[PDB]
Amino acid sequence: SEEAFIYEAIRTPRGKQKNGSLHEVKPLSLVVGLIDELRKRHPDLDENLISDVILGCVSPVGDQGGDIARAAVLASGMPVTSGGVQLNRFCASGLEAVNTAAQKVRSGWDDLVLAGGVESMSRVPMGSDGGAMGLDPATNYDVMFVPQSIGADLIATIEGFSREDVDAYALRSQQKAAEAWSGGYFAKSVVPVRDQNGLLILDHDEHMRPDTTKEGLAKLKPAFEGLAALGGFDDVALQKYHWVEKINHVHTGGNSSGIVDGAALVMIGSAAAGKLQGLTPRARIVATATSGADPVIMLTGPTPATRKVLDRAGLTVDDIDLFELNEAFASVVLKFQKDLNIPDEKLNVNGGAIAMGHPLGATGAMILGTMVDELERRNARRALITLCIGGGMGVATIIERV
Amino acid sequence: SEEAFIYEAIRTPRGKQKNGSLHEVKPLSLVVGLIDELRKRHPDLDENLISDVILGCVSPVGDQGGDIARAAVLASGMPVTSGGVQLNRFCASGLEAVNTAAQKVRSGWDDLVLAGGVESMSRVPMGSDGGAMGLDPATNYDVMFVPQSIGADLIATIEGFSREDVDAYALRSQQKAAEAWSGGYFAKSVVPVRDQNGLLILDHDEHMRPDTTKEGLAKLKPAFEGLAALGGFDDVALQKYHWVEKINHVHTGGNSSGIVDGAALVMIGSAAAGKLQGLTPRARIVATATSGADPVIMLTGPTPATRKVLDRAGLTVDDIDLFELNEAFASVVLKFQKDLNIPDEKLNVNGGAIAMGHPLGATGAMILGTMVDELERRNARRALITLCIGGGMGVATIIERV
Amino acid sequence: SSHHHHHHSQDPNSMPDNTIQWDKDADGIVTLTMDDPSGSTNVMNEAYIESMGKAVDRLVAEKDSITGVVVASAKKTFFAGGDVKTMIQARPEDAGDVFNTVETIKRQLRTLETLGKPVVAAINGAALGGGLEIALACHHRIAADVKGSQLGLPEVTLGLLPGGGGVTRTVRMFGIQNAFVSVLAQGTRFKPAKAKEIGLVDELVATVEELVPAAKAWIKEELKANPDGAGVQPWDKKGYKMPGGTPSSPGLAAILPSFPSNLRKQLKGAPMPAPRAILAAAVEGAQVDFDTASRIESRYFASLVTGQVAKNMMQAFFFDLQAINAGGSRPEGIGKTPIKRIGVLGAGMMGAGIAYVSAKAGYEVVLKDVSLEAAAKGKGYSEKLEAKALERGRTTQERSDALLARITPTADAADFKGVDFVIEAVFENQELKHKVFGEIEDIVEPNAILGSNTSTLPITGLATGVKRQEDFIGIHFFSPVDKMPLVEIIKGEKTSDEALARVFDYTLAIGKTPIVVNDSRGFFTSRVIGTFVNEALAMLGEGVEPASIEQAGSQAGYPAPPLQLSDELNLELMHKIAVATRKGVEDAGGTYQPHPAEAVVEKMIELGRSGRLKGAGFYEYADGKRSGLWPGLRETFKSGSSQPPLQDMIDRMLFAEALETQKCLDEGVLTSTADANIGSIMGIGFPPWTGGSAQFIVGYSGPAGTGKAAFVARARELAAAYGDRFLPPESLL
Ligand SMILES: O=S(=O)(O)c1ccc(-c2ccccc2)cc1
Ligand SMILES: O=S(=O)(O)c1ccc(-c2ccccc2)cc1
Ligand SMILES: O=S(=O)(O)c1ccc(-c2ccccc2)cc1
Ligand SMILES: O=S(=O)(O)c1ccc(-c2ccccc2)cc1
Ligand SMILES: O=S(=O)(O)c1ccc(-c2ccccc2)cc1
Ligand SMILES: O=S(=O)(O)c1ccc(-c2ccccc2)cc1
Ligand SMILES: O=S(=O)(O)c1ccc(-c2ccccc2)cc1
Ligand SMILES: O=S(=O)(O)c1ccc(-c2ccccc2)cc1
């Protein structure tokens, strides 16, 4: 029954896709910077006690190929025994890294593990790595491949979320992200990015539009660029959800997650490993779970995964103080809130990826660290973190403040 | 806490790189074929109890991009809740997938997991994914990047292994592989690849050269196929190992691992999961470990990892009946044997990658299942499986026959 | 956004002068003529940046009436270099200002380049560094094939990189590999003909008067023939494809990991950061758009300018070298004395090399030896060098035959008639040189310079064998003379100031760099290089692996490892010097403190391995080439029993020479640190990244700190661990 604790949880600011501040910064550099910040916080940490470095990364090609986790271990000059493994479970990679790190600590065969993710989407765009489910016609034709936005629009159609409904959520996310930054909530967790000369590159989340109005959101066109712009995917979706006549395309760039660059790091160890290194535990990993739902609608995996992690930890919704669901698309959060009857004042209380962006491999570890701080800032007890995943998967984690 | 058991461990035959029988076979199809073999062996198994599918893959790009583990779940019609994650810890990805699946079961938050790997090196060559440690000159210039072959030659130079020494091991691997195939040892674990029509594609390890002779190996020229032919790496290695004057290039295509295509699957679960699904445990995961050594010599990671997995299991070399180390290079095995005084009759007793090939992401799960089958055949008790890895890493596992 | 340094009000008396003249013809072609009134050379300084800012602003404001632009110069050169006096002062805290300055420079060139109109560079003379970068921003380059004109990006030779777009644009034009190897990594300078061949220049003209007209002619034709693509660089067109591919190209991605390893192999692991930074900027920039790539280039530039190595190299290869070439050590108030006929005594590797560089500079040389057979084989040294230069195309069959024709081999002393400059290169023996000079001093002219190429023997003693000691002087060359750039001029106690100037002027004529050294035991070069090899031989005696010793020498930045160099110096001559030094000490009434290397020398003498000249030293010599380290070396000295850290080995060699240089400065052997720095770099091969063995002290950088105080701390560290010879002199305390 080895218990797993979170000792540090940090992240870079999120640079935007068009004329972004992080476009000149290699993703490896984003991870090394966060390793150097952990050193600044614990200069007498025995890095030899760090036994693995697990990084989530959805497009491990180019700047992100070749086991970027191992590259961060070597480029930062960490001990060669610290390992380094990249994993890809689509949008949950960051949280799957953290959960895998927790499970390794619980097993008793790893003591102190670094976990997180990195995604420089302006340099390595989504889909760069290819893949059978999209690029092999036999498999594409069978699994009924459909981009996520179309599943999200379909969720809005089936559930009755209007264009104004998803826009009302987008506005709320912008307002709560602005309030959290202005309130200093992110001061100690967002680590500014600097060049080799020490000059500043980025110290805030560029994608935010804190002057968002409900009238400007209504002026936006449903204009996804890429696979969604090509034809057929609407018909493929309705061939499965055949009781639906037409898909209402409610999602735009203003109520969908932002394409951004970023990285996040989380330090996880046992009580003995933390006490041996003068570390103060911040939170405890209570339970993790994985489940999933149909891959055509895709983004409904959170509800069985959240259900499973609650029954695994012996808890219910009323036992949870904060719910943090990644804002991939507004309809997914509204669907999740409706199904579990999540009170509004507990849901994504500091804003989410609609305002600040969704750096695929890293997002799960960013919103994980976001709840560690918000539990401490409110002196709240429990937080539940979950993300939808491409292909119909879901990951959930429950943390407890210590 | 929870003990983790191996219930099934199967693999495809390894098709060779040039005019190979598996070149026409998508790497996704190699995995799905193994999933279908598991169904054939256990028709009434409730696949909903399978919570994750963890595939190692070193070049997750192209036919192997887009989370091939999730593609395998959907394409094979497995339950959509079974997840699917790809990971890359270079050469140990296959065994790291099994070790991660074992650690997931020990934590108590997973019941039944499929683990293994896939690598179609004739379709997705090593290096296709890029990477910083090779293609970013700032990182490369500082970590002193060197390809694996030169580390192996450097090991032979230091430890004093001659060209006849490493060729003598290569002949031993070819002999023991041919003896294992002729004796029927691989009859029930190598699953022949068949096409959409059931026609045979491959049913043996076609990289084997059983008529190998000492004279034939002596005629081979040192390695010159990839990064090794390009200049500089010899000087870079000697800038690190400044007491060595000249590197003795003893490794050739005949005493190095073969570039091949293959896949492997391992079913790992708790005692309750097997009792519920009517599965008989074949072996038990006693301990896993990870360590490392210098990244320039690179391939000497197995010695500390084996020492740590023995200490963790409270065992010594004398308590291990079978040693299975991957035959990346002959000098790596000879160094491992010399440093721990491993008896010759306990080391890679059924041949290795020199004879049968080293399908990067799948190798760890192939040589693991090889030991499960040999412990049963010999009625022996304990086996130790370990692989050197690129960058200076190392992974070891101890299994006990059940 | 802005093309100017400041966007706030400054002191009006701080406004820089105007360096760019504006002229617009009736056809709408604007000619920008750079004419900095503060010097003879257009240089990239505060005045240029403000001047180009105003001009580029006016180009944009008047874009309706402007059809094309011509960038010309009014000086003898086109545009040469940057403001080194300002760059060398950039502290690490000034990295923000450095970044902003080069960003502003490139913002001007980017606007010029994307004007929608053709821009032509009329390159009339040298276009070096920032000058070529200005030209590369133009759409077409025309150079005037004229004597002295050079083109290139030599920023790496001062520890910098081309921060005004030179990296980004050459990579966009030639691709990563060719730009780095051919242009960037070594800062190669090209004559206009070669510049056109590789693509640095597009056209040539015979004289400068044709340039501006040819430029306007090309603007007229380009607008007529290619109106859609006029004023559009290849990289600003849809469908641009980088030559050799981008990093994501499968072909270039295959060989790309070998680029840093081949660099480490070329640099031998020396700590020279500039080439690494150029390679990083080159590759990283080829992954992103032009503007992003340009900003990455600025960050690496600021990383080098604020670093210590660039300061060491700017101090040595700019300031120190200019002071030497300006006659800092040449005595004042001395006139010129042209040289008619040179007489070289000795046809060995030294004397044959002296004859080659003397005849290459246009002098008639009489090459005398003991026999005509030997003197003929001496001229064969020049024949073999010319033959190897003809098959490479660096000289004409006409100029080569005229070179060899100036070398007259002889064995007769009477053929030294009419010689006004003697350079003796015979064996190291005092009474021999006394004899050899006595047999020619009457045959040569009365005002002839009597020079001796010696490595060890004092000049004042050698002068007692001639009548006119006022004209006897030491002219120390370095083997191989055709490739070694220093001449150590040694002033004996009776040597006149006129003789110093004539050899000084001779050294510049043959294309070499002179230093002036007072007569002393070992002078400067020999004495200092001795502390280098002796430090390595002592390491061998202590039991350090020979391979580690040679790596430490190579990774310190020396051109040759110390054991290899010892074989070429001949251990027997090292012993003779040690015996000489002990003799002078023990006869003056004192006690001699032997260097621990003297025991290693004697052990090699006893084993019959005195160096390369007798076929065996620390290395095995087969087929005239060198063939690995002697395998018996490890058992003779118990190699491996002592395993000091590599940096200690490196530092012991560097510090031994730095400390010895300070002694030479204290004793008066040298009169200026400029001579000490260039003398160590060009004479004995002290690593260029240090800026010289004197700059090494004031610019030292280690894990303990920076500067003279950190040098002393580290010297005291080495002294406590390896011997009192590493204790610093009082001059440093
Ligand atoms: O998260 S994405 O990588 O954008 C992703 C997008 C789409 C899918 C998918 C959709 C339908 C059937 C099977 C797979 C999987 C992943
Ligand atoms: O197993 S490979 O992917 O071929 C691989 C090869 C080489 C390296 C590496 C070597 C030295 C310094 C840093 C990295 C890492 C992995
Ligand atoms: O306030 S102004 O008179 O407009 C003014 C503006 C700028 C400058 C200046 C520009 C470059 C280098 C140094 C000084 C000088 C005066
Ligand atoms: O490396 S160069 O591009 O040749 C370069 C050289 C010099 C300068 C500069 C120096 C001082 C004041 C203003 C500019 C800037 C760039
Ligand atoms: O802060 S200052 O010392 O005034 C300073 C500022 C800038 C520079 C510089 C500018 C361009 C290229 C290289 C150096 C040099 C010195
Ligand atoms: O004139 S002597 O005193 O015989 C004498 C002359 C020169 C040297 C010497 C030579 C090279 C390097 C260091 C010292 C030593 C002694
Ligand atoms: O100028 S050289 O002839 O190259 C030369 C330079 C230095 C030495 C030497 C001086 C003292 C101790 C050992 C060797 C000998 C010869
Ligand atoms: O590039 S130069 O500055 O002309 C230069 C040329 C040559 C040398 C040198 C080479 C070998 C042994 C000692 C010195 C040093 C500097």
PDB file of N, CA and C in Angstrom, chain C residues 279-330:
ATOM      1  N   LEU C 279      26.565  26.379 -36.311  1.00  0.00           N
ATOM      2  CA  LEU C 279      25.877  25.167 -36.743  1.00  0.00           C
ATOM      3  C   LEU C 279      24.480  25.085 -36.142  1.00  0.00           C
ATOM      4  N   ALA C 280      24.329  25.517 -34.889  1.00  0.00           N
ATOM      5  CA  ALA C 280      23.018  25.507 -34.251  1.00  0.00           C
ATOM      6  C   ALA C 280      22.083  26.513 -34.906  1.00  0.00           C
ATOM      7  N   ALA C 281      22.553  27.749 -35.103  1.00  0.00           N
ATOM      8  CA  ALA C 281      21.739  28.741 -35.796  1.00  0.00           C
ATOM      9  C   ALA C 281      21.389  28.277 -37.200  1.00  0.00           C
ATOM     10  N   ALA C 282      22.341  27.649 -37.893  1.00  0.00           N
ATOM     11  CA  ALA C 282      22.088  27.220 -39.263  1.00  0.00           C
ATOM     12  C   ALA C 282      20.971  26.186 -39.311  1.00  0.00           C
ATOM     13  N   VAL C 283      21.091  25.123 -38.515  1.00  0.00           N
ATOM     14  CA  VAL C 283      20.097  24.054 -38.549  1.00  0.00           C
ATOM     15  C   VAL C 283      18.759  24.544 -38.009  1.00  0.00           C
ATOM     16  N   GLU C 284      18.768  25.164 -36.821  1.00  0.00           N
ATOM     17  CA  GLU C 284      17.522  25.618 -36.210  1.00  0.00           C
ATOM     18  C   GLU C 284      16.793  26.604 -37.113  1.00  0.00           C
ATOM     19  N   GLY C 285      17.539  27.470 -37.796  1.00  0.00           N
ATOM     20  CA  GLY C 285      16.909  28.431 -38.681  1.00  0.00           C
ATOM     21  C   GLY C 285      16.288  27.795 -39.908  1.00  0.00           C
ATOM     22  N   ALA C 286      16.849  26.678 -40.378  1.00  0.00           N
ATOM     23  CA  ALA C 286      16.287  26.020 -41.551  1.00  0.00           C
ATOM     24  C   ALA C 286      14.994  25.280 -41.241  1.00  0.00           C
ATOM     25  N   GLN C 287      14.596  25.213 -39.972  1.00  0.00           N
ATOM     26  CA  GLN C 287      13.360  24.553 -39.581  1.00  0.00           C
ATOM     27  C   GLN C 287      12.162  25.490 -39.549  1.00  0.00           C
ATOM     28  N   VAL C 288      12.388  26.803 -39.540  1.00  0.00           N
ATOM     29  CA  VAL C 288      11.344  27.793 -39.340  1.00  0.00           C
ATOM     30  C   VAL C 288      11.413  28.818 -40.469  1.00  0.00           C
ATOM     31  N   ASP C 289      10.440  29.729 -40.480  1.00  0.00           N
ATOM     32  CA  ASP C 289      10.364  30.780 -41.485  1.00  0.00           C
ATOM     33  C   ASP C 289      11.535  31.748 -41.345  1.00  0.00           C
ATOM     34  N   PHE C 290      11.708  32.585 -42.373  1.00  0.00           N
ATOM     35  CA  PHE C 290      12.901  33.424 -42.457  1.00  0.00           C
ATOM     36  C   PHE C 290      13.016  34.342 -41.248  1.00  0.00           C
ATOM     37  N   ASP C 291      11.912  34.991 -40.870  1.00  0.00           N
ATOM     38  CA  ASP C 291      11.956  35.944 -39.767  1.00  0.00           C
ATOM     39  C   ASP C 291      12.211  35.250 -38.436  1.00  0.00           C
ATOM     40  N   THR C 292      11.553  34.116 -38.189  1.00  0.00           N
ATOM     41  CA  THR C 292      11.868  33.362 -36.982  1.00  0.00           C
ATOM     42  C   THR C 292      13.320  32.906 -36.996  1.00  0.00           C
ATOM     43  N   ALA C 293      13.798  32.430 -38.149  1.00  0.00           N
ATOM     44  CA  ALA C 293      15.182  31.981 -38.253  1.00  0.00           C
ATOM     45  C   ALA C 293      16.150  33.116 -37.960  1.00  0.00           C
ATOM     46  N   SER C 294      15.837  34.316 -38.452  1.00  0.00           N
ATOM     47  CA  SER C 294      16.691  35.477 -38.231  1.00  0.00           C
ATOM     48  C   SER C 294      16.772  35.843 -36.751  1.00  0.00           C
ATOM     49  N   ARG C 295      15.672  35.691 -36.011  1.00  0.00           N
ATOM     50  CA  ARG C 295      15.701  36.045 -34.594  1.00  0.00           C
ATOM     51  C   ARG C 295      16.502  35.029 -33.783  1.00  0.00           C
ATOM     52  N   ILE C 296      16.381  33.741 -34.118  1.00  0.00           N
ATOM     53  CA  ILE C 296      17.251  32.725 -33.526  1.00  0.00           C
ATOM     54  C   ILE C 296      18.714  33.073 -33.766  1.00  0.00           C
ATOM     55  N   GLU C 297      19.032  33.553 -34.971  1.00  0.00           N
ATOM     56  CA  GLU C 297      20.398  33.962 -35.282  1.00  0.00           C
ATOM     57  C   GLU C 297      20.869  35.071 -34.344  1.00  0.00           C
ATOM     58  N   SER C 298      19.980  36.010 -34.006  1.00  0.00           N
ATOM     59  CA  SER C 298      20.375  37.111 -33.132  1.00  0.00           C
ATOM     60  C   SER C 298      20.689  36.619 -31.728  1.00  0.00           C
ATOM     61  N   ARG C 299      19.959  35.606 -31.256  1.00  0.00           N
ATOM     62  CA  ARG C 299      20.162  35.123 -29.896  1.00  0.00           C
ATOM     63  C   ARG C 299      21.512  34.433 -29.753  1.00  0.00           C
ATOM     64  N   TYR C 300      21.884  33.597 -30.727  1.00  0.00           N
ATOM     65  CA  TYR C 300      23.204  32.972 -30.688  1.00  0.00           C
ATOM     66  C   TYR C 300      24.307  34.012 -30.812  1.00  0.00           C
ATOM     67  N   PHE C 301      24.101  35.034 -31.642  1.00  0.00           N
ATOM     68  CA  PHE C 301      25.092  36.098 -31.744  1.00  0.00           C
ATOM     69  C   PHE C 301      25.333  36.755 -30.386  1.00  0.00           C
ATOM     70  N   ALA C 302      24.262  37.196 -29.719  1.00  0.00           N
ATOM     71  CA  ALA C 302      24.414  37.814 -28.407  1.00  0.00           C
ATOM     72  C   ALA C 302      25.051  36.861 -27.409  1.00  0.00           C
ATOM     73  N   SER C 303      24.858  35.556 -27.595  1.00  0.00           N
ATOM     74  CA  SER C 303      25.505  34.583 -26.723  1.00  0.00           C
ATOM     75  C   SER C 303      27.019  34.604 -26.883  1.00  0.00           C
ATOM     76  N   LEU C 304      27.508  34.867 -28.094  1.00  0.00           N
ATOM     77  CA  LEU C 304      28.944  34.866 -28.336  1.00  0.00           C
ATOM     78  C   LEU C 304      29.586  36.197 -27.954  1.00  0.00           C
ATOM     79  N   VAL C 305      28.960  37.315 -28.336  1.00  0.00           N
ATOM     80  CA  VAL C 305      29.529  38.637 -28.074  1.00  0.00           C
ATOM     81  C   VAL C 305      29.735  38.862 -26.582  1.00  0.00           C
ATOM     82  N   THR C 306      28.779  38.431 -25.759  1.00  0.00           N
ATOM     83  CA  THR C 306      28.898  38.609 -24.318  1.00  0.00           C
ATOM     84  C   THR C 306      29.772  37.550 -23.656  1.00  0.00           C
ATOM     85  N   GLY C 307      30.232  36.541 -24.404  1.00  0.00           N
ATOM     86  CA  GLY C 307      31.081  35.514 -23.838  1.00  0.00           C
ATOM     87  C   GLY C 307      32.544  35.919 -23.805  1.00  0.00           C
ATOM     88  N   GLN C 308      33.353  35.087 -23.144  1.00  0.00           N
ATOM     89  CA  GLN C 308      34.746  35.451 -22.902  1.00  0.00           C
ATOM     90  C   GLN C 308      35.645  35.127 -24.091  1.00  0.00           C
ATOM     91  N   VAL C 309      35.386  34.013 -24.783  1.00  0.00           N
ATOM     92  CA  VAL C 309      36.245  33.607 -25.892  1.00  0.00           C
ATOM     93  C   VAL C 309      36.240  34.661 -26.992  1.00  0.00           C
ATOM     94  N   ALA C 310      35.059  35.183 -27.335  1.00  0.00           N
ATOM     95  CA  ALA C 310      34.994  36.226 -28.354  1.00  0.00           C
ATOM     96  C   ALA C 310      35.792  37.455 -27.934  1.00  0.00           C
ATOM     97  N   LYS C 311      35.792  37.773 -26.638  1.00  0.00           N
ATOM     98  CA  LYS C 311      36.613  38.880 -26.161  1.00  0.00           C
ATOM     99  C   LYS C 311      38.099  38.560 -26.288  1.00  0.00           C
ATOM    100  N   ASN C 312      38.501  37.333 -25.942  1.00  0.00           N
ATOM    101  CA  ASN C 312      39.892  36.934 -26.137  1.00  0.00           C
ATOM    102  C   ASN C 312      40.305  37.058 -27.594  1.00  0.00           C
ATOM    103  N   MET C 313      39.445  36.618 -28.510  1.00  0.00           N
ATOM    104  CA  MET C 313      39.830  36.586 -29.915  1.00  0.00           C
ATOM    105  C   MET C 313      39.774  37.972 -30.541  1.00  0.00           C
ATOM    106  N   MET C 314      38.764  38.770 -30.188  1.00  0.00           N
ATOM    107  CA  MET C 314      38.751  40.161 -30.626  1.00  0.00           C
ATOM    108  C   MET C 314      39.989  40.903 -30.136  1.00  0.00           C
ATOM    109  N   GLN C 315      40.421  40.632 -28.903  1.00  0.00           N
ATOM    110  CA  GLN C 315      41.607  41.304 -28.383  1.00  0.00           C
ATOM    111  C   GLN C 315      42.857  40.902 -29.158  1.00  0.00           C
ATOM    112  N   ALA C 316      42.979  39.619 -29.505  1.00  0.00           N
ATOM    113  CA  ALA C 316      44.182  39.141 -30.175  1.00  0.00           C
ATOM    114  C   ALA C 316      44.144  39.429 -31.673  1.00  0.00           C
ATOM    115  N   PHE C 317      43.138  38.895 -32.370  1.00  0.00           N
ATOM    116  CA  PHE C 317      43.137  38.918 -33.827  1.00  0.00           C
ATOM    117  C   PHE C 317      42.630  40.224 -34.413  1.00  0.00           C
ATOM    118  N   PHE C 318      42.121  41.139 -33.593  1.00  0.00           N
ATOM    119  CA  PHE C 318      41.809  42.485 -34.054  1.00  0.00           C
ATOM    120  C   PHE C 318      42.783  43.491 -33.452  1.00  0.00           C
ATOM    121  N   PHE C 319      42.714  43.744 -32.145  1.00  0.00           N
ATOM    122  CA  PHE C 319      43.502  44.828 -31.564  1.00  0.00           C
ATOM    123  C   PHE C 319      44.992  44.499 -31.545  1.00  0.00           C
ATOM    124  N   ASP C 320      45.365  43.367 -30.943  1.00  0.00           N
ATOM    125  CA  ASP C 320      46.783  43.033 -30.829  1.00  0.00           C
ATOM    126  C   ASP C 320      47.444  42.915 -32.197  1.00  0.00           C
ATOM    127  N   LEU C 321      46.753  42.310 -33.161  1.00  0.00           N
ATOM    128  CA  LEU C 321      47.359  42.100 -34.470  1.00  0.00           C
ATOM    129  C   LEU C 321      47.475  43.406 -35.249  1.00  0.00           C
ATOM    130  N   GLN C 322      46.499  44.311 -35.100  1.00  0.00           N
ATOM    131  CA  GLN C 322      46.608  45.614 -35.753  1.00  0.00           C
ATOM    132  C   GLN C 322      47.778  46.412 -35.192  1.00  0.00           C
ATOM    133  N   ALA C 323      47.976  46.368 -33.872  1.00  0.00           N
ATOM    134  CA  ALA C 323      49.077  47.107 -33.261  1.00  0.00           C
ATOM    135  C   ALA C 323      50.423  46.596 -33.752  1.00  0.00           C
ATOM    136  N   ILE C 324      50.534  45.284 -33.964  1.00  0.00           N
ATOM    137  CA  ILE C 324      51.782  44.718 -34.459  1.00  0.00           C
ATOM    138  C   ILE C 324      52.022  45.145 -35.901  1.00  0.00           C
ATOM    139  N   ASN C 325      51.009  44.992 -36.760  1.00  0.00           N
ATOM    140  CA  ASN C 325      51.149  45.375 -38.161  1.00  0.00           C
ATOM    141  C   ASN C 325      51.376  46.870 -38.337  1.00  0.00           C
ATOM    142  N   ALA C 326      51.010  47.680 -37.348  1.00  0.00           N
ATOM    143  CA  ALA C 326      51.228  49.118 -37.408  1.00  0.00           C
ATOM    144  C   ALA C 326      52.638  49.528 -36.997  1.00  0.00           C
ATOM    145  N   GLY C 327      53.500  48.579 -36.635  1.00  0.00           N
ATOM    146  CA  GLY C 327      54.862  48.902 -36.253  1.00  0.00           C
ATOM    147  C   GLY C 327      55.043  49.262 -34.791  1.00  0.00           C
ATOM    148  N   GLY C 328      54.254  48.640 -33.912  1.00  0.00           N
ATOM    149  CA  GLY C 328      54.385  48.915 -32.489  1.00  0.00           C
ATOM    150  C   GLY C 328      55.740  48.520 -31.931  1.00  0.00           C
ATOM    151  N   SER C 329      56.303  47.418 -32.427  1.00  0.00           N
ATOM    152  CA  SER C 329      57.618  46.962 -31.993  1.00  0.00           C
ATOM    153  C   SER C 329      58.740  47.417 -32.914  1.00  0.00           C
ATOM    154  N   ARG C 330      58.407  47.943 -34.092  1.00  0.00           N
ATOM    155  CA  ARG C 330      59.419  48.481 -34.997  1.00  0.00           C
ATOM    156  C   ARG C 330      59.965  49.792 -34.439  1.00  0.00           C
TER     157      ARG C 330
END
